Design a protein around this ligand. Structure first.
Ligand SMILES: [Mg+2]
Ligand SMILES: [Mg+2]
Ligand SMILES: [Mg+2]
Ligand SMILES: [Mg+2]
Ligand SMILES: [Mg+2]
Ligand SMILES: [Mg+2]
Ligand SMILES: [Mg+2]
Ligand SMILES: [Mg+2]
Lengths: 114, 151, 206, 79, 99, 127, 100
RNA sequence: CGGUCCGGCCGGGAACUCAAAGGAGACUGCCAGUGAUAAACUGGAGGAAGGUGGGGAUGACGUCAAGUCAUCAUGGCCCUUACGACCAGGGCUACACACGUGCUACAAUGGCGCAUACAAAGAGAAGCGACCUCGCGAGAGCAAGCGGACCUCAUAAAGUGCGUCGUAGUCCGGAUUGGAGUCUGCAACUCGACUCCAUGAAGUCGGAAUCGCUAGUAAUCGUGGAUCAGAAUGCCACGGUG
């Protein structure tokens, strides 16, 4: 197989197979198989090219992979050039959503160094 | 247990075969007080063990048990600043209790797909005496035969 | 260590409440503030009147204050002269109609709050604490107390280092719930600070 | 962030946005209101927003619409 | 029809002493008397910190017991209704009358 | 008239009615197997019917309220044995030995202030 | 608490009834009825002109004697310290030391 | 038992569960052994309970000039057109790090989906708010009952039955961030909770060292409450399995 953004889906069940794209989680994957009329409990084996392109046409509606990644990064840059709080924190590699930094903030800061 | 000389709690026998030794065995595997999912795994491992070793489910447990049942163990006692391992003869009740304990501990350390598989393959290894549990009875014996002078 | 309040622990066992009324969550708080407000007024006014206890019951939309006093003649006055002036403002503080009843304190040398207020008043008169304590214990014992314990705390006699001195005579079984342990506090506001009086009077078992 | 049912603004601030449109752009608009959402009728003005001690003059832009005036005024000095 | 009297009191020995006064007066002035029915007591518990500052484990646990009694009188006789209305009950007992 | 026995264990309380003939079990308008999803809990109600014989000798109408699986089951177990002595009163001696006559007074311990659970104390720090 | 802090609560009650009980409550439900007025209302705007202390959520439950803004119990309207003080003197009806 | 819309639902029944007031019972009392014929201990009978039956409340004289002048009270000292008082905005939520207490994990004794059995104890009129309708949802509109063994919060989860994944940084695990929203509240930017969609960090069981618990205990699984406009992984409390 090969769908929307260069990626080659594994020989795992249809729903978990599609989640491999950057822009489709558990919900879009349950709806894309519902809008194309394909089962969720079936592997890539038996799924012919006529069934693959109809799922490619279904996912093309919502911005996925590289087209989505630049949009995510654009909003981040927009905030940064505006001079906002939300921006000044993406620029300082610190948690934006208001979390505590006095301790436990290792995901945004990265690993510690004395 | 400084002044208080208490006895031991007499537990209810097994719901299937009526074995007190198995009733102890289920409780030893039992985690988070989930006795249901505990006896489920003990029976599923007994079903896959007796079949793959020639029936006799009560005897298929007993065979693997004699190879893990120890005779002597060490008691860490401080006398003059130094710690001395003294060899002491184990009691029949503790003999069984210790055996059953290592069987479970070794099965948990295994890399199989399920606990019904982990328990069965460890009971198989102990019946032929070539698992992690028989080695845990061996390390206890090398320690006891070494410190034999302080008996 | 720390001791449990002798009255609080005996509430329901051998000791009664000072507020017997019933109310739902809606007006329980408002009643308690009204109760504290009325008791505050009465202790202030009847200061030299020897009040020992003040019971508040609320029959329907009314208040019934039972003033326990060893000097009822001064509380009542010249034919209800002093009762009427008190009742009039108890009704103003409470908001509902008022009815004041006076209970007589026969033997005041056997009342905790009274013995305590006496010692407190004596210290404020610059009398020696050891004399006040001994007089309190002696009077109580000869009048029929099975036991008595009196404790005075802090800067005793204007001292720089605070002490907690206590005198005791008889039996004082603080652990027997069955025992009639009358206990009360009083504070002597002196020239050199606060002196806390604590009195325990054992009256007998059951 | 908030309920869709009408975005929020201060009346002492909204009256100052109007007084600057008709009479022409003046010096920095001294305002304390940090809680107000920016409207399109503000773009091009100099609103001096408080931080705690001083008034941060921020020139209004079209991308600033929808966000609060308190995002462009730093509160905690960290050096 | 039927007169429903709901008794609420913080003291238990007070509620059934005032319940006996309702029951006896009603059956003496000839009326059909159902109960005294002992309804479940509501136990409002309170936990407070005993120390003025710090000492989180140092606590006092209190309870307010709200005792309940139900007395159902079937016959609303004029000899009964009037006798019960001119009954002097304890001030610490709440009496709810349901028609 | 029916034979009654009251049995309870933990927060579960059970009422047991004994009538001779057949070997039926009706627990809260349901079958013995329909109610309990555990065979261990099924064998404990079968326990009083081993020392004292019954295959299809006597029926039982049973209702149990409160608690859980083994609790409900344990309560019934006490009820049957109490209803069995109501019928004979000579079956006492055989029922004592088995240990079903005794009400299991083992109730869950209340949570205590300071502590995390009934006995579990929080983790101690020296420094 | 401070005398000024106690007075600040008096003002917060005095205004809580005057406005946000009989007047601000009307313009709040209006600022929720979708059926009538969708843009030209000024209800949300004129809510700001009303004094701030008039809000019910701007008041802090305080001990009715001391003024303590913490450890409050609604049932008695007092902080945990003064509750215990009155409780022990039997000044709180039906309240005694529990054990179960 | 009489009648069935098969729902204690309606006449009825006061038996039983249960509710809550009074009372009985357990005292080494009996028997046997050990023991200075004593105290006591061990074992057994009877008994629902046996050796203070289980749990709580109850904390002696005192020790640490231990903790609290910021609950309150108060000697002394200090400010008194200011150390007082009003208001807006900000901060207590900062973040190179170190320590303490927790939560969730690292998975197949497990994740997910569907079906389904069984609690206890609580809270409620400026309140709990059903049923019905709209929305994927958080919710919203409409609108009963209930100051409550009646009504509501409210479907207990573990468990069990069936199917799936098949030892993989994974259908484990859920952090962080983007977009869009909901509710409360004058007002959620700093700094709320929750929802939807998307993102899928670290971590495959933790070094030296160290903590709790002796039975309905530990371990685990839900439930409720106080505070509270809103804001629990904390605290207080409840039963299930064990
Ligand atoms: Mg993804
Ligand atoms: Mg003051
Ligand atoms: Mg508040
Ligand atoms: Mg009783
Ligand atoms: Mg004692
Ligand atoms: Mg000091
Ligand atoms: Mg997941
Ligand atoms: Mg112990």
């Amino acid at each position: 197989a090969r769908i929307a953004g260069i990626n080659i889906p594994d020989h795992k069940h249809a729903v978990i197979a599609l989640t491999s794209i950057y822009g489709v989680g558990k919900t879009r994957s349950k709806a894309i198989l519902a809008a194309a009329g394909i089962a969720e409990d079936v592997k890539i084996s038996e799924l012919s090219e006529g069934q693959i392109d109809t799922l490619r046409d279904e996912v093309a509606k919502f911005v996925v992979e590289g087209d989505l990644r630049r949009e995510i990064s654009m909003s981040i840059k927009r905030l940064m050039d505006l001079g906002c709080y939300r921006g000044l924190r993406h620029r300082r590699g610190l948690p934006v959503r208001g979390q505590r930094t006095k301790t436990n903030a290792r995901t945004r800061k990265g690993p510690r160094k004395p | 247990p400084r002044r208080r000389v208490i006895g031991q709690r007499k537990i209810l026998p097994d719901p299937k075969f009526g074995s007190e030794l198995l009733a102890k065995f289920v409780n030893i595997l039992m985690v988070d007080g989930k006795k249901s999912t505990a006896e489920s795994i003990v029976y599923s491992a007994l079903e896959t063990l007796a079949q793959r070793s020639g029936k006799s489910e009560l005897e298929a447990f007993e065979v693997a048990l004699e190879n893990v049942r120890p005779t002597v163990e060490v008691k860490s006692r401080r006398v003059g600043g130094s710690t001395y391992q003294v060899p002491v003869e184990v009691r029949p009740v503790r003999r069984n209790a210790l055996a059953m304990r290592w069987i479970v501990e070794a099965a948990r350390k295994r890399g199989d797909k399920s606990m019904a598989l982990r328990l069965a393959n460890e009971l198989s290894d102990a019946a032929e005496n070539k698992g992690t549990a028989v080695k845990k009875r061996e390390d206890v014996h090398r320690m006891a035969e070494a410190n034999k002078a302080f008996a | 260590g720390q001791k449990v309040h002798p009255n609080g622990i005996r509430l329901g066992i051998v000791k009664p409440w000072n507020s017997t009324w019933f109310a739902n969550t809606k007006e329980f708080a408002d009643n308690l503030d009204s109760d504290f407000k009325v008791r505050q007024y009465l202790t202030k006014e009847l200061a030299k009147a020897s009040v020992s206890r003040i019971v508040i019951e609320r029959p329907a939309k009314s208040i019934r204050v039972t003033i326990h006093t060893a000097r009822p003649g001064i509380v009542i006055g010249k034919k209800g002269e002093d009762v009427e002036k008190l009742r009039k403002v108890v009704a103003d503080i409470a908001g509902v109609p008022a009815q004041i009843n006076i209970a007589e304190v026969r033997k005041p040398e056997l009342d905790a709050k009274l013995v305590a207020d006496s010692i407190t008043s004596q210290l404020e008169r610059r009398v020696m604490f050891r004399r006040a304590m001994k007089r309190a214990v002696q009077n109580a014992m000869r009048l029929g107390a099975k036991g008595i314990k009196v404790e005075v705390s802090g800067r005793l006699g204007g001292a720089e280092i605070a002490r907690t001195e206590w005198y005791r005579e008889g039996r004082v079984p603080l652990h027997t719930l069955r025992a009639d342990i009358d206990y009360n506090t009083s504070e002597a506001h002196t020239t050199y600070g606060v002196i806390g009086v604590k009195v325990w009077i054992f009256k007998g078992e059951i | 962030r908030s309920l869709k049912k009408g975005p929020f603004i201060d009346l002492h601030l909204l009256k100052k946005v109007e007084k600057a449109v008709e009479s022409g752009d003046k010096k920095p608009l001294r305002t304390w209101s940090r809680r107000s959402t920016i409207f399109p009728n503000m773009i091009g003005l100099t609103i001096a927003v408080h931080n705690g001690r001083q008034h941060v003059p921020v020139f209004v832009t079209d991308e600033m619409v929808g966000h609060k005036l308190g995002e462009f005024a730093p509160t905690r000095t960290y050096r | 029809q039927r007169i429903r009297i709901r008794l609420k009191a913080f003291d238990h020995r007070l509620i059934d002493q005032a319940t006996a006064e309702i029951v006896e007066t009603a059956k003496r002035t000839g009326a059909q008397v159902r109960g005294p029915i002992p309804l479940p007591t509501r136990k409002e518990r309170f936990t407070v910190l005993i120390s003025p500052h710090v000492n989180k484990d140092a606590r006092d646990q209190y309870e307010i017991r709200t005792h309940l009694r139900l007395v159902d009188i079937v016959e609303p006789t004029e000899k009964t209704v009037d006798a019960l209305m001119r009954l002097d009950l304890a001030a610490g007992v709440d009496v709810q009358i349901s028609l | 008239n029916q034979y009654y026995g009251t049995g309870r264990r933990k927060s579960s309380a059970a009422r047991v009615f004994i009538k001779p003939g057949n070997g039926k079990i009706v627990i809260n308008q349901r079958s013995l197997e329909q109610y309990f999803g555990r065979e261990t809990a099924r064998m404990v109600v079968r326990q009083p019917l081993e020392l004292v014989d019954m295959v299809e000798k006597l029926d039982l109408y049973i209702t149990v309220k409160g608690g859980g699986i083994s609790g409900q089951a344990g309560a019934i177990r006490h009820g049957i044995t109490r209803a069995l002595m109501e019928y004979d009163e000579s079956l006492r001696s055989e029922l004592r030995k088995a240990g079903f006559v005794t009400r299991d007074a083992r109730q869950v311990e209340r949570k205590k202030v300071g502590l995390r659970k009934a006995r579990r104390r929080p983790q101690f720090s020296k420094r | 608490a401070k005398q000024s802090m106690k007075a600040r609560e008096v003002k917060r009650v005095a205004l809580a009834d005057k406005y946000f009980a009989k007047r601000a409550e009307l313009k709040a439900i209006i600022s929720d009825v979708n059926a009538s007025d969708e843009d030209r209302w000024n209800a949300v705007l004129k809510l700001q002109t009303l004094p701030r202390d008039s809000s019910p959520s701007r008041q802090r439950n305080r001990c009715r004697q001391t003024g303590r803004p913490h450890g409050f119990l609604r049932k008695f309207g007092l902080s945990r310290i003064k509750v215990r003080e009155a409780a022990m003197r039997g000044e709180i009806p039906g309240l005694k030391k529990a054990s179960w």
